[PDB]
Amino acid sequence: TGRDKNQVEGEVQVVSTATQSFLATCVNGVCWTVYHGAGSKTLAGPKGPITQMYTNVDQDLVGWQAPPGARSLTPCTCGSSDLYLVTRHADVIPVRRRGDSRGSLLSPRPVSYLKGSSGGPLLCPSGHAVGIFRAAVCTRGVAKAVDFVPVESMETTMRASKKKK
Amino acid sequence: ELXX
Ligand SMILES: [Zn+2]
Numbered sequence A: 001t002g003r004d005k006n007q008v009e010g011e012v013q014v015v016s017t018a019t020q021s022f023l024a025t026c027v028n029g030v031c032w033t034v035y036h037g038a039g040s041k042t043l044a045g046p047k048g049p050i051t052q053m054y055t056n057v058d059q060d061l062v063g064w065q066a067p068p069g070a071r072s073l074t075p076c077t078c079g080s081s082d083l084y085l086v087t088r089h090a091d092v093i094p095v096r097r098r099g100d101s102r103g104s105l106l107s108p109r110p111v112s113y114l115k116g117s118s119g120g121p122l123l124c125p126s127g128h129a130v131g132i133f134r135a136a137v138c139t140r141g142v143a144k145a146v147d148f149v150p151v152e153s154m155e156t157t158m159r160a161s162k163k164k165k
Numbered sequence B: 001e002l003x004x
Helices: A151-160
Strands: A012-016 A021-027 A030-034 A052-056 A061-065 A082-086 A092-097 A102-110 A121-124 A128-138 A142-150
Touching: A012 A030, A021 A121, A021 A128, A030 A052, A030 A128, A030 A151, A052 A151, A061 A151, A082 A128, A128 A151, A142 A151
Parallel strands: none
Antiparallel strands: A012 A021, A021 A030, A030 A061, A052 A061, A082 A092, A082 A121, A092 A102, A102 A142, A121 A128, A128 A142
């Protein structure tokens, strides 16, 4: 198995489908994202196609088997409400946590600005993943708050079943 | 709103 397998360090990779593009995060050696963005289908990343490891239409979340030589993000362990969201345009929007899976937007931005960011991971100022963006809440083209799935939900999804035939 |  002598393979160079040279790659650049990057916990978050760019993932896209045949309808839209979004970002995913690898937690515990497992990629994570929302179902409406990726869904239970093949994902084309920078390396190529990706195999499906976990799927949950009810929870709107899917995961892929992380290839070897990949990094992972630890869970948040600081009780910090403030969170940082990674946008596909290399933009970080400070989001204050207002619940287990609910947050608020300090700067009112158009929904288009947040589009293409679902699946991205949110990291607390300490430097640990806190969850993944799922959808934004807006009234008339302006989003004032956002919703994300905490990393704790991932533990129950994998524990409930391992998608084994 | 879903974004994805
Ligand atoms: Zn933390």
